[PDB]
Structure formats: C-alpha cells, structure tokens
Amino acid sequence: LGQKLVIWGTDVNVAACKENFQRFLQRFIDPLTEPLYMQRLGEINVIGEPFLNVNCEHIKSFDKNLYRQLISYPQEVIPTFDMAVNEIFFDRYPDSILEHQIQVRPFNALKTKNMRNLNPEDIDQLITISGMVIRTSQLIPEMQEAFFQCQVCAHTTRVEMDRGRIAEPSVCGRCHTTHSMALIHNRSLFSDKQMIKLQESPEDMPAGQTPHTVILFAHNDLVDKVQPGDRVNVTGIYRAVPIRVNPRVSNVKSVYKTHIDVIHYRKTDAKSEKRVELLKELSRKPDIYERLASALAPSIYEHEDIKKGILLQLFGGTRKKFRAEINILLCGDPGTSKSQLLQYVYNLVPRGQYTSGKGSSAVGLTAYVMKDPETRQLVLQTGALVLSDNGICCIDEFDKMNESTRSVLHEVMEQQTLSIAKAGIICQLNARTSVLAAANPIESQWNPKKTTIENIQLPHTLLSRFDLIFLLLDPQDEAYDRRLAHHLVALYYQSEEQAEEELLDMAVLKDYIAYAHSTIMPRLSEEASQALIEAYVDMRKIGSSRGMVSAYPRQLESLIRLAEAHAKVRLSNKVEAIDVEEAKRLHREALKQSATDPRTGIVDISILTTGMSATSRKR
Template identity: 60%
Template sequence: MGFFFAGGSTPLQYGSPAPSSSRDAAGSRSSLVADSSRNAPGRSRADLNSEVRHHRNIALEDPEHMNATQSPASSQQEGPRIFVWGTRICVTDVQLSFSRFIKEYVNMALEEDELIIDESGKQSAAAEADEPYYMQRLHEIFNTEEPYLNVNLQHIKAFDETLYRQIICYPADIIPYLDFIANEIFNESYPHSELQSQIQIRPFNADRTKNMRCLNPEDIDQLITINGMVIRISGLIPEMRQAFFECAICKNTNEVEVDRGHIEEPTICQNCNSNHCFMLIHNRSAFMDRQVIKLQESPDDMPAGETPCTVSLYAHGNLVDSVQPGDRVTVTGIYRVVPLRVNPRKRLVKTVYRTYIDVLHYRKIDAHRLKQQDLASKLPPQRVAQIKALAAKPDIYERLAHAIAPSIYEHQDIKKGILCQLFGGSKKTSADSSHGHWRSELNILLCGDPGTSKSQLLQYIHHLVPRGQYTSGQGSSAVGLTAYITRDPETKHFVLQTGALVLSDNGVCCIDEFDKMNESTRSVLHEVMVRHNYK
C-alpha cells in the first residue's frame, strides 16, 4: 500500500499509489520488484511480514549444488540459479511452475464463490472449457480493478504437488514470488491497465483443515486453515509500512521501510553528518489498515464439557472489516509466534511465546448451513431454476416442514411455526406516525412437558442458521446476552465484548430454559423482541 504527494505534503492516504521517485528507488534495489511495478507501486505485504528484496537467498552456478528435483525446463536456463536460503527450493522452478499453472490450468468443477464475474457484473460459470481458469480471473481483475487473486490450493495440488508442499511449508518465502509472476503475466496480457497496487495472491482451501486445539509448534510459520466463529473485532489500527524522516538541520530526507515489524530510525545524516537529527514526518509516511480479530472454536468442534479455545487474527489492508462478530468462517493464514518480554527495557524474553495468525484469506462457506444473506452474492441460474421448480409443487409447505428436524417424529404444527420464523415476512411501514413500521420477524415460545424434544428443536435450528446462537436461560445475565466492556489485551483499549443477542444478528437466538431466567434478565429481551435492537 502506498501514498501520493500533492505539493510535497498531503494527509494520510491509505492504499494510494506511491510517488514515482520511491518506485524508481525500489526498482533500483531489486529487478524482481521493478519489473512487476510498472503500473503499480511495489510495497511489502504486511500479512507476510516480508518481501522479495529482503529474502535471504543464494545464487549457485555450480551444477553440483543444483536441486536434484529440478524440472527439465528450468535446467535449460542459463546463468546462476537462485535458491531460498536454508532450503533446496529453487526460485526459478517455483516461478516456472506457477507460470504454467496460471496459463494452463483448466477446471470446470467450480464452487459457488469461484464463479467468474463478467463485464456486466454478474456471476457466471467459465465461458469456454478450454480457457485457463486463472487467466479468466486476471481478466476479472482487469474489469473490477481489485488487485487480489484467490488461488485454490487444491488446484495447485492437482497440477503440481511439489509446488503445493512448498507453499504450505514456506508461505512467507514462496508467496512473494507468486505475486511477482501474477503481476508479470497480468502486465503482459493487459499492458494498458492501471492498478492502484500490485496483485496479491490469496491462497485458500488447504488439503487439511486443522482444529484450533491441534495447533502446535510444528505449524509455526506454515500455512494453516482453521474454522471458527468471530466473537470480537477491534477498530482500525493504522500500521506504518514506510517511515519518512527529515533532518532538522539540512532538511535532507530519508525513507525507511518496515523490517520484520520494526522501523530503524537513522542516526547519522549522510548530508551534514549530524547525529540524532532526524524527525519523523507522519503525513508523508505510508500506512496500512490493520485489525485484530478474536476467533473462537466452533460449537460443533468443541468437546463436551470443555471451554472454547480462541486465537487472535491479524487482518491487513482489504481484509479489514471483511467479517463481523457472529460469522462462521474458514481462515487461511500463517501461524506466527512472538516472544513476550519480561521488561520492555530489557533483552530478556519469556520461554512462553504468544501466538497469532496473519490472515491471507477468509471464506464464509459451510455446506451444512443455510446460505448467509449477502446482498453482494447471487445464486447461480441452476439453483434459481431448482428453487422455482420446488416452489411450484402444491405440497411445498408440508415438504419443508418434514425437512426440519426429520429425526423428530410429528410436531408438524411446531415445525411449521419454526419454518415461518426462518422465512420471516415482509417489512411494512405505516403512514400513521403512531404505528411506525411492523416488524417482519417472528418470536416463538415453545412450551410443553419434559421429553417433548423442545431442546432438540432448538439445537437443530442453532446448527441450521448461519448466525444462530444457543444459550441457556439458567445462569444467563443481561450483560452476557447483550454486551459488556472489557480491555483488549492487544491494544489496551476498552472494547465491547458481544453477547449472544449481538452475535445472532440477522440470525436466530435460541434460549433454552427460558422459565429459569430471572426477571431482570428477561426484561432485556422485551425491546430486542419488539424492535430487534438494544440501546
């Protein structure tokens, strides 16, 4: 993410292009970045905590040191071969393999969120079976001007399993080179395109989705995929990516980029040889949005009698505000650790490290739940035709009622009432000011003898609705249902910890043992049930 200048000094501009002088300086330091930054500025990726020109690599000209598993095409390349430091991964092999994958991979078995957006802004399947899928994705980037390429890792595994293992084991080293290849192919295909920033690769759908409880030191700095429910998000945190320093004596300027999360302030001015004379100019520095997200273990994956596990997520750039509390997501990112210092002024660190995940991709898909009400997504034509054919049947009401909790016998009237609650009604507004508007949502109270499957029906609806929450009225408090104030351990700011009612927004909140709830807690639900808001 960059910034631009207007008359030498501007307000903070997140994600805007960098000046030509900084692009030229970056290009002189690395030919890899210079080639791909013809139309967009080259910036380090905050989610990877590294960039191409800062990677440690080694160039070998001796054939004896070459990788034994190199491809025939790469063995014909002349000149030194560059390897990632400490590994046998050849950068040339990685770039050639990913370039062939982008240009040759064809797949028609696409999922709903992998459909192509055409020029009219509608989702459609691939137009031609023999056209490479990711070349169509690059054409979509050309139309939408959103420089993000989502890459399904299962596609890479089917095409080149060696490249797949390299991405999983060394994501911070490999993904920047994949970014370079994607930008190079895009610039060759669309030379007149003007993107605001470079195309970034976002891998997802790894072969094995790990449970949050199974994360261990073997996963550190590797690409992982976990499932969970978002319970808390922080506000936008501006993170500095490039610092602009100015000498207080001779006005000489110096730009310093972030290196592994730190920015080193220059001590000596190269122009006047003065010591400790630099001042940080904030409005000429480059910043990027960052957000801290708390992900909790899904109730489906939680063992009986255990407390839910949580993990912190760091989202950067365009991924900020992509999820809301209550969303169930599949997160793909890099598992990180950071040492805890005994005293900030001492070099001693604790033996226990703090863990977090740098998010690379979100996915809000669960095949066992109802689809979320996302206005940006549209159903494919095949699904629309299937729904219309089902709606035309005369016994559609009974069919849907039988489909709710089929393991529970009878209770058809109760199931039909729950069905009406799931579908809801249409919101109406009255011209009479005394009425205002009538709500379209229904509230249901299940009363009956013990053993009549009341709790089982609540559990089924909780697992069916994408933003459903299940809680017990016995022991619940008003703040536990709504929200309470707590201190964020990351930012040390006071934040609102959301409760069950807030997490079930646009969903269904299932409260069991409602009669055992005390009167003060039950009074909180009055306004929520009538107006569906709480103040």
C-alpha cells in the first residue's frame, strides 16, 4: 500500500511525496494562466514524446522540502514523480494513449558542482555538472526481461532482471527436467544504453591543470542525444559501483568506480511564410547584390569584388559532366585578411568545412583508412573534400600542400569525385564541393616582379581549374591606411547594437542563401546565350594581336557558372544579360588581378602555362 511505503532508513513517505509532486503540478502557474507543466502535459498528448522536463528551481521555489528530497533521494523519488505524472496524465485527458509511461526529467539550469569537487558524500545524490563530451560509445543493448525456453518440451517463460542478475528457472514447470531451460537471447527484451566520457570545460579548469573526466551512462530514449566535441550541462545520479579484480573472480576492488546515471541533457553551445515573404521582398531591393556582398564579412575592409565572388560561390550555379561548383582562390601575404575571411565564411553555410593544407590539419583532404581506437576495426575516414560534398571547403595555407594532396585535389576539382583503393576497399566517393582557397607567396612578401603562379609555386593544372583568382594585398596608399585604421578603430569600438545588427544580417544572409538553394533553378534565356557567345568570341578576338591565345572554352563555362549564380542571387530563375554582364565584369577583374604579367599587363597564357612570354623569351 502506498501510505505504508517509506524510503529506506529515510523517513520520507512515498505517498506524501507523490501527492506533493501532484500539488506542484497542479499549482505551479508562475515560472516568472494554466500550470506550466500541465500545459506541457497537454502538449505531450499531440507531440508524443515519452518525457516531461521539469526545472529543479521551480520545484525549490514551490517547496524547499520537496526539492531537498528530490536531490537527496532521486533513486526512489524520481520513480515516485514518474508515477505521479502518469497518474495526472490519466486524471487529465483520461482517454489518451501513449506507447510508454512518462519519464520525468528534473534538472537545475546551472551546475550545482564541478567535477573536481565531487566527493563520496555526493554518492546517490542528484547532481548536475558542466562538461564537454570526449567520446561516445556504441549503442549497448542492455537486457530488461530474460526469455527462457525448455530444450526438451518447448515450454517458455519470462523473468525480470532483479539488479542486473537473472533468476534462472533451474527446472521446467511443464516437464520437470532440471537444467533444461535455456536463455533465448533474441527473444529476450533489451533497452538502449550508451557510455559517454565527459571532460570539464576549459574555462572551469584550474591554472595549467590537465582535465578531469567522468563517465556517463544514458539509457533508453535519452541514448544518442550528444556527440563528441559538444558542450552540455548534464543532470544525473552520482553512482558508485564495485569493479571486479579479474573477469573470472567475484572479488571486487575496495576503491569504487563512479559514473553519472544521466537523467537530463541540456546543450549549452549549439545555438516560415514570414521568412519567405521577407526574403522575396528583399530580393526586389535595389542593389541587393551589393547589399549581400557587403553583408559578407563585416570585419573585413574594402574587398568588394572578393566578397562578390564569395557570394556567387555560396549561391553556386545550376546543378546540371556539368559541374556547377564555383572555385575561388584568394592570394596574398601571410597575416592578411584572407585567413580571417575563410574562418568566417566556412560556418556561414550548411555542409561547410575548414581545413589546413599542411599536415597538422585535423581533417585531411585525402580519404584514408584507420583502426577505430575504441573497437580496433577498420573505418574509412573520408577527407574534408568528401565531407563537404554539397558545401564549401575552405582550404587555408593552400600553397604548401604536398604533391599527393595536390594530385587528389586536382582529381576532386576536375572530376568531382575522390577514388580510393587503400586496403581492399575500392570505391569512388562523390565530392561536389566548392573549393575556396587561400594561398601565400613562397617568400614572406608578394613580389610584383613575378606573376601569381611563379610566386605561389602551384601548378597550372590546379590554377586553371579555379573560376576566379583574387589578390588580397593592400595598397601602400596613406589614404588606404588611414581608412583601414579608422575601420579598425570602429571594430574596436564595436558594441551591442552593432553586434545585433551584424547578427541580424548574418541570419537573413544564411536564410536567403538556403532558400535560394532550395527553390531557385536558373535557366538560359536567348539574350543570355547570345551574350555568352559574344563574350567568348570577343575575349578570343584579343588573340588577333601577337598571334596569341587570349581565352579558352573553360572560361566560357566559368562565365556560365557565374551568370547562373548571379541570377540565383536575385531569385530571377532565368539568367539574362544583367547577370551575364556582371559575370563578365567580375571574371575580367579577376583575370586582371591574377593573370597580369608585370611587363605587358593581363595575358591569358599565364593561367594556361607557367612562364609567360616575357619570361620564356629568355631562351
């Protein structure tokens, strides 16, 4: 009987606790009006989730003693609260159906302890701690009901798990043969379980100390909700269990291993027609192209055409070998704005990636095969170019990638695939990634006596695959320096209003790009076709002088990509002469910056081969 039940050696009455929690559910209307948690139990009826999250601050404000009993004795109290919630969910809404009994999930919003100060006095208390997940194990199947069958006579029985053990039948009731009941593993019933290793956050550490870690266990319906690298305030019971000295011996070490029996996660670092009509109205705004290009990278100064090219890359061409991915190269001295621009723009798009061209990159450009450490089996770890299969890949310090990386990147940029024949695996992974690059000069400074390919020492076989190449060196003008200094002073005086304006611009920019990807598919108009043919023929007519080649058809395909991207920027859905002229302008400016021989200006052969005519005529 409920009224006779009392927590063991505790004098807390279970029925009183249940009724007090029901009173909390009934009366708590005031988080700052129906009760908040009865509103949530109205929502759960249609949402269908099997849990009710509740705030321990709310419980404490309603009743100090109930909160204290929850914190002190969660192992008994939380099942009591579950029974209370499942009674209320059929007192109200009595005709409802739900596949599982509701699980209450108490939590304090902030940490009650930090993991360095956990003590044995905290054992079996409800606590919550802040941390970062280091590793997350495979889904462990944990038994909850053992199904036994008689080997002789096929009689079956079911027995509950007591405290992890099984009360094996020892004799079959329907034929009385001893030791004849056999556990049928796949007829038994299992719940989900997973181990999570949690490290304290870096700011919480003492000065120069290595991290402490704690083990978490998350069970059914709360199992796979966290990933490595994320941050969480995790609420659970601080358990202490014995560990056996040897797997074949039941002696246990005197020192108990501890872990967190997880009850609630709260991720702390992860974060419509109105949106559609706002974006549609914004697409008709005058100079929307310049508006979006200026919204790109507010911290960076004056680089208009670079931002415009990055915008056209982020919008991309029309998908349908018909590669629509626009390739962009940034080129300039170390310490300049290109690295900051890459580190900004990679998080501005879904499916994006950022990596270094050097061997210290966390995720390499090439796919490889490794032994997964937690299980020591082979796993095909694909590279960043493959993980960014429909997004931008930001390759910083592009220039100094080794020859194998150069070859596989050439393969990716030309074929939009990455072939691997490593360890018996033979497969051709898709990589429709938009390569955005940042390349330094080989020496410490840019050399105006030399063109881009000779300064950066990259092959023409890679440089000719890029749609646009831009120079990020700064002028030596005192007006430029003074304007840059005023801009940097404004960045120093950046305040909350500028931050909110920049974040509003960032949000609408992300939404605009995603919507344009989702719905816009530009297609050629007749004037677009005539303009593109005219552009290619005109830029080929320059070759009448000196008998040189001044263009090649991949330039035309690049212009098609850029025009389609510009049409997608303004949500036209049909590409026409306005887009084609902007594509021509930006493309010609990129060639003017990149393909300029110092002796004669722009010359197209610099991209086709290294060593332009003014250099090669030494021999």
